[PDB]
C-alpha cells in the first residue's frame, strides 16, 4: 500500500505533458540516448535520486540565513551542532565534493596505521559490508585492496532476510586474521548497504562489527548517505528498537563507528553537500589531519566550501530527513513500485531501497546483448511515457581499453531510482502502466547500434540508431 | 481517472500523522469544532481552497524581486503588463482586501449611471448569472437589489449540462425590461459560476450576454477568481474552441466584459491579492474614480497595498494558472473525489468545480437537524482520518437575530474544497475511505449540543458536546 | 556623527545612475510631478518610509515557513507568541489593511462605553498626545470628536525638550472633566508621537497618563508604529531606564495601555501587516468584539488576511526592530541628515524622528504660494540629484470643495522621510549637497501652474508646467 | 571620492557592536589569532572578498528556479546561454571546486600539445602576465614550470601606469623562443592581474599577446575571476573604449583567448561556483576532454556539481557583475580606503584592485619579525575596532619543512580585502580611524610568541600570547 504524503505540497516545478510524436522526434534527436535529452522533455526523471529530491519549508528558508565568513561562521557552527546532537560526533568537516571527502580520510587513515602500527602498503586491505563504487575507487587509487564481507543472503532474491546489508561477521574476522590487523587501515560500514539494490544493516550487526574492529583497534567509518532509511528499517524490523525514535536509533547506531562520511544528497534531503565527522577526542588527530589535507589536497593551498545558506540548510535537513512519517512514506513508495512491477511480470535482478534493476534481457529476449536491450528499453520507456532511466549493462560497460572489443556483461539491466518527495502514487502507477505496455509490445522493439561513439564514458554522449 | 501531476514537487510542508486517541482528545479540546483545531493537528485540511494552494518555482522566486516604491513601482508595471497581455485590459488596480474591491466598483458604477442616465437608487437592480455572496453583500449594502438569472439546468443534478453556469439570456432581457435599463447599474458575469458547486459559462453565452448589456449600455464586470478553470471547461466542452489555447480563450472571453474584478487566491495561485481592471479608455473615468475611492474609501486618505514581491508573484501566477496540463490535472482531481464518493453511496446535494456538498442528513438520518448532523459528520471525519471540513447547515445558519430561535435550514451539508496542487490521489483515496468508514458506522455517531455559544458568527468559536 | 551600519549588506536592488538631461526629460514627461515618475528613474526615493525599508535575513527567510491554514495556523501562533513575549499582551489580531484596524477598535470602544456607562454619541470626545491623521479620521467618521493634548514644548523649535511627544497631563485631566468621563470612549497614546516631525513620549509620562485613564476607567490604546524608536529614546534620554534593554523598556511601556494598534510597516520592518492586540482578560470582550467585527465589517462576512509567511516574518521583525545597535544607527542617520541641512542654511518648520519638513517658501522666496514653491523644489531636487520627496503645502492642500478656490496654506513644506536600512551616509551627503546646490541656484527656479488637474487628490496625478 | 551606492539595500545580516573589554577577552580566547574568532564577534571582516559579497534581488530569486536534473538541466542551459551572449563562448562547463577546474584544463592542454607537437614534459614552460597561486600550483604539480612575464612598471609603486597588469610582450616572445614553442602548453591571461595588489590589463595588450600566441599556435586561457573590473578599467583608462559598454568591452576582450577559467566568487557576485569555457569548435576536443576528465578526475567516475539554483544565480550574476554603476562604485570604494590610509601616514608595500598590503613592519618597527608584527597589528586592529584582517608575513610563511627553522620573510604585511557591496563609506572611515589610532599607540603594541603551533598551515589554528 502506498501511504498518503505526510505533508502538503507547497512549491512545484511545472513539467509539460508531451505527445508521443514529440517524444519520438526527441529521442531520435538525442541519438537514442536519454542522457542527451533536455530535462524539460522528460516527464518522470528516474535517472538518479542524488540531490534531485524536494526540500522542506524550513530547509529552503535556511538558505537565506547564511553567514559567509571564511572562518568562524555561525552557519558552520549550526551544522556542527546538528551533527553533535544527532550523531553525537564532536568534530565536523563540511564537504562539497564527491561523497564525503573519501579522497581525504582514506590517505589519512592509511598513513596513521603506517606510522603507528607499521602498516605495509603492499599488503593493506580494507573491509566493508559493501563498498560504494567511489569508496572502492579512492581505496584502490591509494593502493589499498578492498573486500566486501556481505552475508550469503545478501544477493539471494529467493530468500527473504530482514537485514541483507549485514556484515559477514566471521568473514570479517577471518579476513583481518588473514591479512594481518596492522595491514587493515579501516573498515567501512555502509548504511543502508548498496548491495542488492539497497539493504539495511541491523544495530546488532553494527555492534558486533564494532567490537571486532575495536578488538584490533581498526578505525570504523560509517558511510551514511542513507542513515535515516537504515534507522527506519531497524525500527521496523529489529524488535529491540521497535519503540525507539529514529533519532534514538541513530544516536545509538553511531556509537559503533569512530567517524562518519556521507553525501548529504540522499537522506539528508539537499542538492549539495557532504560531511566528514569524528566522534570524539580519540580521533582528534584524524580530524586535524583531514582538515589539513582538505586545504592542501592538491599539493598546495586551495580554498572552497559550501556557502553559508547550504550549511544552514543541511543543519535542518539532517533533522527533517529523520522524520518518521516521511521515512515510512518514502520507503513504502519504493516498495509500491517494485511490487507493482512484479505483479505485471516484470523481473528485476535485484531491487531494494536504493533502486530497482529491471532485467531488460528477459523483457526483450529477441535483442542481442551487443545491441543493448536495456538501452532499447530505456528508449522505449521514454517514447511511451516520457520516463528516463539509466542502462546498467553492455552499453555502460563499454569496450576493453586494450582490445577495443566490447566487454562481456553478466546481465542487461535498466536502473530505476526515485527522487525523494518528488513523484506521487499516480506517477508510480504511470510507470507500472508503461512497463505493462512495453511488455505487451516487446517483440516489436528494436536493438541499437552506434552512429557516434566516444572513446571513454560512451554512455553519456554516444548516439545510436535502430537496427 | 486521476491524472499524474504535470510537475515535480519541490518544496513540502511536513504534516504529522496522529493517532486516533490523539485526535479524539484534540476534537474534544476544540469543543467538537474543527475551526478550533490547530492546523498542525489537521492531516488533510479541506476548509477552503482560497489562498491555501501551492505556488510554482517562478512564482515563489518573484517574491524576491519586489520594488517597494509607493508609486511607479516596476512590480506594479509587471502586474499591469500581465493583465494587458492576458486579458487585454489597459487599466489595472491591485487589491489586497476582500475579493477584488467590490466595495469599490459597486458604488462607483451606481453613481455613474445615476449621473449619466438618471438611475433611481430606490429602483435599481443588478444582475448576474450568479452573484458570489460578498458581491451580493456589497450590492445590497449599497442599497442595490440583486437577481440571479441562472438557467433551469443550473441546480438540476438529475440532468447533465455542459455549461450550468450560463446566464438565462431571456431572463436577463426580461429583468432589464422589467426594472428599466436606467436602473441597472451593472451586470456581473461570474466565471466559473458559484451555482451548484461551481459550473462553467460558455463563451457563446458570454458573447450573447454582452450584446444584451451593450444594447442597453450597461457595464459588465467579470468576477473571475476562477477564470482559468472556466477557460479550460470551454476548451473541453465548447466545440468551437477545442483547438484554442487557454490563453487565446481567455483573451477572447474578456472581450465580453468592460472590466474585471477578481480574488487572485484561487486560479491565480497566490495566498494574497486581487485585481480590479478596466478594458479600455471607454472606462477610463471608471478607473480614475475607482482608484480615487481606493484611497479615500474610509472617508479620508488611507494608504495600503500589496508588497512589491506580491505583485511580481501575481504577475507570474496569472500565467502559471493558465497552464493547460495543470488545469486538466486540477479539475480531474476534483472530479475523481466526487466520482469516488458517489461510488460508495455518499450523496451530495450539489458538486462542481468549487466544492462538493455532502448531504450529512442522508448519511446520518438518526440525528435531528437541531443537533447539527453535518457538524457531527465533520467531527467524525476528523476523528477517523484527521480531515477538516466546513459545515454548511443549521450550525452555520445560526439563530434569528430578533427571536433568538434557531433558523430553519433546507439541508445539512458538509462542504469539501480542495486546495490547489496540495494533495494527491492518495489523499483523495484516503478521504473516500474515511467516508466509507463513516457510512459503515453511521448509526453510532452522536448529535451535538452547545456548551458555549457566541451571539454572532457562532460557527467559528462555538464549543459543543455529544448528546 | 553617522554611525557605521551594525550589519553586513546581503541583498541589493540595483538603481541606475541617470544623466541630468535624462531627468530633465523625465520630470517633464511626468508633468513636473514626482508622484508620476517611474521608481526606476528615482535614485533616492524619500517619498515614504512606510513598508519601503530593508528586512533582515531571518525575516526574509521566515516568508518561506508559512502555514496558510484558514484557522489554527502555526504562523498566527508564532506572531501571537512574539506579541505575548514582547508586549505582554495575550490577545493578537493580525491586520492587513490600514494602520492597525483603527476602523475596528474605534466603533467597538464607542459602543462599549455607550452600553456600560451610557456614553452620549453627541458629546463624545477622544484624546491623544497627538492623533495620527488616519486615527483622527476613523474617530470623526464614527462621529467622535478628537483633541490633541500635547505639551507647550511640542512644536517649539526654539526650545530643546527630551520628550516633546509627552501628553499634557493637566490638559488631559481638564479635558475629561470638561467632556465628562462617560463621554470619553478612549485615549490613544501615540509612540513615538507624530507631532513636530516625530517626538518621543517618556515612560514617566505614559505611567502618569495611564493612572489618569485608569482612574476614570477609560480604555487606553497604544498607537505604536514606532514603538522601538520610542523605547530607544527612553533608554537614551530617560535616566531611570539608561541601563534597561529595549526589550525591558518595551515590556514596561506596555503595562500602561490596555491594548495596542500598529502598522508594522515602520519599526517592525515589514512591507505589509499590522496588529490589534489586547493585554489581558479584562479586555477579552473587546478582543472578541473586534475579531467579530473584523469578519463582518462590511455588514456581512468577508474573508482576507496576511499570508502565513507574512505572519512568520512579522513574528521575527518585532524582535529585529528592537535591536539596540540598529535603533541607534537608524536614529543617528536621521539626525545626521537634519544637522547637515541646518549647517548649509536649509530651514525646516519641524524635524524629528519621522521626517524633516523643509521650508520651501524661505528657500525659494520669489515663488508665489499659489505657484507651489515646495512642488517646484521637489522637481528641482529631482532634476539635480534624482531625489523624490513629497510636497506638504498648497499643492497638497487643494481647493475648497464648495468654492473651487485654492485653500489657504500656512506654509509650503517639502517632506523628507528615510526608508529604514536602505540608504547610506553617502546618500545622506548626496542629499545635503543637492540642497546646497539648489540654495545656490534658488533665484533661477520657476513656479508651476496646472496643465491637468483632477477634482480630488490632485497631488497624486496632476500635471503642471513651469511659469 | 566615495560614490553613493547605485542600489537600495534590501536584506541585511545583523552584526552586534561589541565593547573593547569584550574584544580583548575574545582575542585572548582565540589565542591572538583572528582566524580563530567567531564570525559574530567580527564587526568588519576583511579576511577575503571571495564569495563573501552581497547578491542582487534577481540573483537571489534565481536560486528558487532550479532544475536539478542530472543532465539536460534548463538551469545549465541558462548558464551556458549567459556565457555565449556575454563572452561569445560556445562551450560551458560549470565548476564547483577550486577556481575554475585548473586541475582539469592544465593536464588536458599539456597532453594535447604532447600528442600534436611532441611537447617535452621535461622542458615545458607555461607563461602568464602573472599566475595566481593556485594556477601556478596546478601547473607545477603537473610538472610544468611557470614564468610571469609582467612589465617593469608592475611592482613599481613610485610610477603610475594605467595597466600595470600588462604582459611584457617582448618577454613572452623571448620566453617562447628560449623554451621552444612545442614546449609551451598554454599561456594564461589573468584579468585583472594579481600582481601588485590587482592591476588591469589593456585590450591592446591582450590583442598583441593573442597574436603572439596564435603565431605559435599556443592555447590562451583567460583567468577571469575579475573580468568585469578589468573591463571597467579599460573603459576608464583605455581611450579607444571610452564610449563602449562593459558588455561590449567584455565581448571584444574574449576574442583574444581560446578559453576561459574563472572562480565566480569575485566579480560574478556568487558565494559558490566557477566556469571552464571554450570559445568555438576549434577547441571542441579540449572541451570534450575536459568534461570527460571532470568525471574521472579521481581515476574513476565521481559525480558532483552545482545545484540548479546556483547555476541560475550565476547565469544572472555574470550580467549584474557587469553593471557600470556598480563597478564604478566598487572600485571607487577600494581606492577611497587606500587614499584614506595613505593620508594618515599608513604605508602599503602594494595596493590595487584586489587588496591593500599594509606594511606592519614600518608601522610597528619595535617588533622583531620573528615576533610577527603583522599578526600583532591584526590583533590590535581587532581589539580597537573589531576588524579582522589576514597576515601575509613571517607568521604565514612558516618554518622550513626540512630544518624546522623559521623561514626568512621579505616584509611583514597585513592584507585588507573588501567584500563586494557589503560595507559602506562609514565602515571605510571606521577602518581608517582605527589605523590612525593604532599608529598613535604603536610603540605600546607587543610582539607575539607561540603557545600552540601546528606542524603545517600554522596560521589557521596556531595560538599565541604577547611578549
Ligand atoms: Cl527560517
Ligand atoms: Cl526569478
Ligand atoms: Mg563561502
Ligand atoms: Mg508597499
Ligand atoms: Mg491566507
Ligand atoms: Mg545536482
Tell me the shortest Cα–Cα distance from A69 to chain C, in angstroms: 11
Q: State whether residue A133 is helix, strand or coil.
A: helix
CA nearest to D264, candidates D83, D105, D66: D83
CA nearest to D216, candidates D136, D127, D129: D127
CB contact under 8 A, D10 and C13: yes
- C-alpha span between B209 and B203 (Å, rounded): 10
Which partners does chain A have (≥3 C-beta pairs < 8 Å)? B, C, D
Length of chain B counted residue by residue: 467
- C-alpha span between B210 and B218 (Å, rounded): 9
Beta strand extents in B224-368 (DSSP E only): 259-263, 274-278, 348-351, 356-359
Buried b (16+ CB within 10 A) or exposed e, B444-457: ebbbbeeeeeeeee
And the C-alpha cell for D266?
Answer: 569575485
Buried b (16+ CB within 10 A) or exposed e, C397-426: bbeeeeeeeeeebebbbbbbbbbbbbbbbb
- Please report residues of A whose CB lies closer than 8 A to that of D15: none
**Pair B412, B372: CB distance under 8 Å:** yes
CB contact under 8 A, D137 and A70: no
CA nearest to C108, candidates C304, C287, C301, C298: C287
- Please report residues of B whose CB lies closer than 8 A to that of A43: 4
And the C-alpha cell for A160?
Answer: 527473504
- C-alpha span between C465 and C446 (Å, rounded): 9
Strand partners, B277: B92, B260
Q: Is the peptide bond before B192 cis (omega within 30 degrees of 0)?
A: yes
Of D14, D54, D423, the CB nearest to C11: D54
Q: Is B65 on the interface with D (CB under 8 A)?
A: yes
CA nearest to A151, candidates A200, A114, A184, A117: A200
Angle in degrees, CA A177, A183, A184, rounded to 5: 75
Tell me the shortest Cα–Cα distance from B267 to chain D, in angstroms: 21
- C-alpha span between D103 and A398 (Å, rounded): 26
Distance, CA C271 to ligand 4 centroid (Å)? 5
CA D252 to chain centroid: 23
| Residue among B1, B3, B5, B8 with most chain A CBs within 10 A, to mutate | B8
Tell me the shortest Cα–Cα distance from A399 to chain B, in angstroms: 37
Of C44, C45, C54, the CB nearest to D9: C54
Beta strand extents in B89-247 (DSSP E only): 91-95, 125-128, 145-148, 187-190, 220-223
Backbone Cα Rg of chain D: 23
Of C47, C304, C457, the CB nearest to B97: C304
Distance, CA C62 to ligand 1 centroid (Å)? 5
- Whole-angstrom CA distances from C191 to B416, C167, C203, C243, D71 are 46, 11, 10, 21, 58
Burial class of residue D242 in the structure, from the number of CB atoms within 10 Å of its CB (0-12 exposed, 13-18 middle, 19+ buried) = exposed
The pairing of beta strand C220-223 with beta strand C145-148? unpaired
| Other Cβ atoms within 10 Å of A443 Cβ, number | 8
And the C-alpha cell for D359?
Answer: 606594511
Q: Reported resolution in A?
A: 1.9
And the C-alpha cell for C339?
Answer: 544637522
Which D residues, 95 through 134, put their C-beta within 8 Å of a C-beta on chain A? 96-99, 103, 133-134
Q: Is D6 on the interface with C (CB under 8 A)?
A: yes
And the C-alpha cell for D449?
Answer: 610568541
- Render C131-199 in DSSP notation, one character per residue: --HHHHHHHHHTT-EEEE-B-TTTT-TTS--TTTT-B-HHHHHHHHHHH-GGG---EEEESSB-GGG-B
Distance from first CA to last CA of chain B, Å, rounded? 41
Q: Counting ligands in written order, which one lies closest to the CA of residue A309?
A: 3
Q: What is the CATH number of domain D1-56+323-467?
A: 3.90.1150.10
Number of inter-chain CB pairs under 8 A, B vs D: 20
Length of chain C counted residue by residue: 467
**Pair A108, A291: CB distance under 8 Å:** no
CA nearest to C359, candidates C351, C349, C372, C367: C349
The pairing of beta strand C91-95 with beta strand C274-278? antiparallel
Strand partners, C278: C91, C259
What is the helix, strand, coil percentage profile of chain B, to 5? 45, 15, 40
Q: Which residue of B has its CA nearest to D7?
A: B67
CA C66 to chain centroid: 28
Number of inter-chain CB pairs under 8 A, B vs C: 169
CA nearest to A359, candidates A334, A342, A382: A342
Q: Is C69 on the interface with A (CB under 8 A)?
A: no
The pairing of beta strand B348-351 with beta strand B356-359? antiparallel
Q: State whether residue C414 is helix, strand or coil.
A: strand
Q: Is A1 on the interface with B (CB under 8 A)?
A: no
**Pair B169, B93: CB distance under 8 Å:** no
- C-alpha span between B376 and B32 (Å, rounded): 8
Distance, CA C307 to ligand 5 centroid (Å)? 4
CB contact under 8 A, C61 and A57: no
Beta strand extents in B348-427 (DSSP E only): 348-351, 356-359, 387-388, 390-392, 413-416
Phi, psi angle pair for D67, to nearest 5° = -110, 105
Burial class of residue A402 in the structure, from the number of CB atoms within 10 Å of its CB (0-12 exposed, 13-18 middle, 19+ buried) = exposed
- C-alpha span between D383 and C383 (Å, rounded): 46
**Pair B274, B34: CB distance under 8 Å:** no
- C-alpha span between C400 and A464 (Å, rounded): 83
- C-alpha span between D70 and D74 (Å, rounded): 11
Buried b (16+ CB within 10 A) or exposed e, C226-260: bbbbbbbbbbeebeebeebebeebbbbbbebbbbb
- C-alpha span between C265 and C273 (Å, rounded): 7
Of D63, D296, D309, the CB nearest to A457: D296
Phi, psi angle pair for C94, to nearest 5° = -70, 140
CA nearest to D232, candidates D163, D169, D167: D163
**Pair D123, D179: CB distance under 8 Å:** yes
- The CATH class, in words, for D57-322 is alpha beta
And the C-alpha cell for C465?
Answer: 508646467
- Whole-angstrom CA distances from A73 to A67, A70, B405, C170, D306 are 6, 7, 66, 55, 21
Maximal C-alpha separation, chain A = 66
Q: Provide the CB-side half-sphere exposure for D405 (13 A, CA).
A: 4
**Residue that the C-alpha cell 438557467 belongs to:** B151
Q: Is A51 on the interface with D (CB under 8 A)?
A: yes
**Pair A217, A180: CB distance under 8 Å:** no
Q: How was this structure determined?
A: X-ray
- C-alpha span between A257 and A255 (Å, rounded): 6
Which A residues, 305 through 364, put their C-beta within 8 Å of a C-beta on chain D? 305-310
| Other Cβ atoms within 10 Å of D140 Cβ, number | 16
- Render A431-466 in DSSP notation, one character per residue: HHHHHHHHHHTGGGPPPEEEEE--SSSHHHH-EEEE
Distance, CA B230 to ligand 5 centroid (Å)? 23
- List Cβ neighbours of D279 (8 Å cut-off, separation of 6 or more): D87, D88, D89, D90, D91, D254, D257, D258, D259
The pairing of beta strand C220-223 with beta strand C259-263? parallel
- C-alpha span between D121 and A106 (Å, rounded): 30
Distance, CA A66 to ligand 3 centroid (Å)? 9
- C-alpha span between D36 and D460 (Å, rounded): 7
**Residue that the C-alpha cell 577600494 belongs to:** D334
Tell me the shortest Cα–Cα distance from C57 to chain A, in angstroms: 5
DSSP code for B97:
S
- List Cβ neighbours of B57 (8 Å cut-off, separation of 6 or more): A11, A12, A13, A14, B10, D64, D65, D66
Maximal C-alpha separation, chain B = 66
- C-alpha span between C93 and A237 (Å, rounded): 49
Q: Which helix (H) or strand (E) holds A223?
A: strand A220-223
Strand partners, C359: C413
- List Cβ neighbours of B416 (8 Å cut-off, separation of 6 or more): B46, B337, B355, B356, B357, B358, B389, B431
DSSP code for A159:
S
- Please report residues of A whose CB lies closer than 8 A to that of B55: 10-12
Angle in degrees, CA C286, C292, C295, rounded to 5: 140
**Pair D336, D1: CB distance under 8 Å:** yes
- C-alpha span between D420 and D5 (Å, rounded): 12
Query: In this structure, which residues have their CB less than 5 angstroms from ion ligand 2?
Result: B 61; D 61
CB contact under 8 A, C64 and A65: no
- Please report residues of A whose CB lies closer than 8 A to that of B54: 8-12
Q: Provide the CB-side half-sphere exposure for C288 (13 A, CA).
A: 15
Distance, CA A99 to ligand 3 centroid (Å)? 19
- Please report residues of C whose CB lies closer than 8 A to that of A58: 65
CB contact under 8 A, C69 and B307: no
**Residue that the C-alpha cell 536495456 belongs to:** A374
Q: State whether residue D225 is helix, strand or coil.
A: coil
What are the start and end residues of each CATH 3.40.640.10 domain in chain A? 57-322
Distance, CA B48 to ligand 5 centroid (Å)? 10
- Whole-angstrom CA distances from A460 to A397, B225, D72, D93, D437 are 12, 47, 11, 15, 62
Of D14, D17, D425, the CB nearest to C425: D425
Beta strand extents in D68-196 (DSSP E only): 91-95, 125-128, 145-148, 187-190
**Pair D328, D172: CB distance under 8 Å:** no
Phi, psi angle pair for D11, to nearest 5° = -135, 135
Q: Is the peptide bond before C192 cis (omega within 30 degrees of 0)?
A: yes
The pairing of beta strand A390-392 with beta strand A413-416? antiparallel
- List Cβ neighbours of B127 (8 Å cut-off, separation of 6 or more): B146, B147, B148, B149, B172, B175, B176, B184, B187, B188
| Residue among B1, B9, B322, B327 with most chain A CBs within 10 A, to mutate | B9
**Pair D421, D321: CB distance under 8 Å:** no
- C-alpha span between B127 and B147 (Å, rounded): 5
Handedness of CA C211, C216, C219, C225 (dihedral sign): negative
Distance, CA C424 to ligand 4 centroid (Å)? 21
CB contact under 8 A, B423 and A57: no
Q: Is B61 on the interface with C (CB under 8 A)?
A: no
- List Cβ neighbours of C287 (8 Å cut-off, separation of 6 or more): C91, C93, C278
Please list the alpha-helical segments (H only) found in A321-424.
324-343, 360-363, 373-385, 394-397
Handedness of CA D294, D296, D297, D302 (dihedral sign): positive
And the C-alpha cell for A255?
Answer: 556509537
**Pair B231, B251: CB distance under 8 Å:** no
And the C-alpha cell for B243?
Answer: 483547438
And the C-alpha cell for B253?
Answer: 472571453
- List Cβ neighbours of A111 (8 Å cut-off, separation of 6 or more): A289
- C-alpha span between A22 and A15 (Å, rounded): 15
| Other Cβ atoms within 10 Å of A77 Cβ, number | 17
Q: State whether residue D200 is helix, strand or coil.
A: coil
Distance, CA C448 to ligand 4 centroid (Å)? 29
- C-alpha span between D229 and D335 (Å, rounded): 13
- Render C281-334 in DSSP notation, one character per residue: GGGHHHHHHHHHHHHHTTSS-------HHHHHHHHHHHHHTT-HHHHHHHHHHH
| Residue among D26, D43, D71 with most chain A CBs within 10 A, to mutate | D71
What are the start and end residues of each CATH 3.90.1150.10 domain in chain B? 1-56+323-467
CB contact under 8 A, B65 and D66: no
Spell out the SS3 assignment of D253-299: HHHHCCEEEEECCCCCCCCCCEEEEECCHHHHHHHHHHHHHHHHCCC
CA nearest to A209, candidates A244, A171, A241, A153: A171
C437-441: which pairs have CB atoms within 8 A and are 24 or more residues apart? C437/C384, C437/C385, C438/C363, C438/C377, C438/C380, C438/C381, C438/C384, C439/C344, C439/C345, C439/C346, C439/C363
And the C-alpha cell for A300?
Answer: 598546495
Interhelix angle C324-343/C425-440, rounded to 10 degrees, is: 20
Phi, psi angle pair for C258, to nearest 5° = -100, -20
CA nearest to C382, candidates C32, C53, C48: C32
- C-alpha span between B177 and B108 (Å, rounded): 23
- C-alpha span between D272 and A304 (Å, rounded): 8
- C-alpha span between D127 and D131 (Å, rounded): 8
Amino acid at each position: 500500500k502506498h501511504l498518503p504524503e505526510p505533508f502538503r505540497i507547497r512549491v512545484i516545478e511545472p513539467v509539460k505533458r508531451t505527445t508521443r510524436a514529440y517524444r519520438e522526434e526527441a529521442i531520435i534527436k538525442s541519438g537514442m540516448n536519454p542522457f542527451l535529452l533536455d530535462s524539460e522533455d522528460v516527464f518522470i526523471d528516474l535517472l538518479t535520486d542524488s540531490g534531485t529530491g524536494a526540500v522542506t519549508q524550513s530547509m529552503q528558508a535556511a538558505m537565506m540565513r547564511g553567514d559567509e565568513a571564511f572562518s568562524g561562521s555561525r552557519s558552520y557552527y549550526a551544522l556542527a551542532e546538528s551533527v553533535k546532537n544527532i550523531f553525537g560526533y564532536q568534530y565536523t568537516i563540511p564537504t562539497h565534493q564527491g561523497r564525503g571527502a573519501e579522497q581525504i580520510y582514506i590517505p589519512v587513515l592509511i598513513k596513521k596505521r603506517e606510522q603507528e602500527k607499521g602498516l605495509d602498503r603492499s599488503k593493506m586491505v580494507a573491509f566493508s559490508n559493501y563498498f560504494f563504487d567511489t569508496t572502492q575507487g579512492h581505496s584502490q587509487i591509494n593502493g589499498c585492496t578492498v573486500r566486501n564481507v556481505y552475508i550469503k543472503e545478501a544477493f539471494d532474491t529467493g530468500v527473504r532476510y530482514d537485514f541483507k546489508g549485514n556484515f559477514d561477521l566471521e568473514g570479517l574476522e577471518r579476513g583481518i586474521e588473514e591479512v594481518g590487523p596492522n595491514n587493515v587501515p579501516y573498515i567501512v560500514a555502509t548504511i543502508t548497504s548498496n548491495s542488492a539494490g539497497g539493504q539495511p544493516v541491523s544495530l546488532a550487526n553494527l555492534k558486533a562489527m564494532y567490537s571486532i574492529a575495536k578488538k584490533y583497534d581498526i578505525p570504523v567509518v560509517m558511510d551514511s548517505a542513507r542513515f535515516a532509511e537504515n534507522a527506519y528499517f531497524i525500527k521496523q524490523r529489529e524488535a529491540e528498537y521497535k519503540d525507539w525514535t529514529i533519532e534514538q536509533i541513530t544516536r545509538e547506531t553511531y556509537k559503533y563507528a569512530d567517524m562518519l562520511a556521507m553525501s548529504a544528497k540522499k537522506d539528508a534531503m539537499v542538492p549539495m553537500g557532504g560531511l566528514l565527522c569524528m566522534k570524539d577526542d580519540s580521533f582528534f588527530d584524524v580530524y586535524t589531519e583531514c582538515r589539513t589535507l582538505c586545504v592542501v589536497q592538491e599539493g598546495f593551498p586551495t580554498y572552497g566550501g559550501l556557502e553559508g545558506g547550504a550549511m544552514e540548510r543541511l543543519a535542518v535537513g539532517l533533522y527533517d530527513g529523520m522524520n518518521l512519517d516521511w521515512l515510512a512514506y518514502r520507503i513504502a513508495q519504493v516498495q509500491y513500485l517494485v511490487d507493482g512491477l512484479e505483479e505485471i511480470g516484470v523481473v528485476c535482478q535485484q531491487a531494494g531501497g536504493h533502486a530497482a534493476f529491471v532485467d531488460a534481457g528477459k523483457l526483450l529476449p529477441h535483442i542481442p546483448a551487443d545491441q543493448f536491450p536495456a538501452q532499447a528499453l530505456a528508449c522505449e520507456l521514454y517514447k511511451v511515457a516520457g520516463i528516463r532511466a539509466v542502462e546498467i549493462g553492455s552499453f555502460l560497460l563499454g569496450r576493453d581499453p586494450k582490445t577495443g572489443k566490447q566487454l562481456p556483461c553478466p546481465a542487461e539491466l535498466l536502473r530505476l531510482t526515485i527522487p525523494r518527495a518528488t513523484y506521487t502514487q499516480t506517477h508510480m502507477d504511470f510507470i507500472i502502466e508503461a512497463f505493462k505496455h512495453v511488455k505487451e509490445n516487446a517483440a516489436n522493439i528494436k536493438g541499437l547500434t552506434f552512429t557516434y561513439e566516444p572513446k571513454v564514458l560512451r554512455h553519456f554522449t554516444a548516439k545510436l540508431k535502430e537496427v
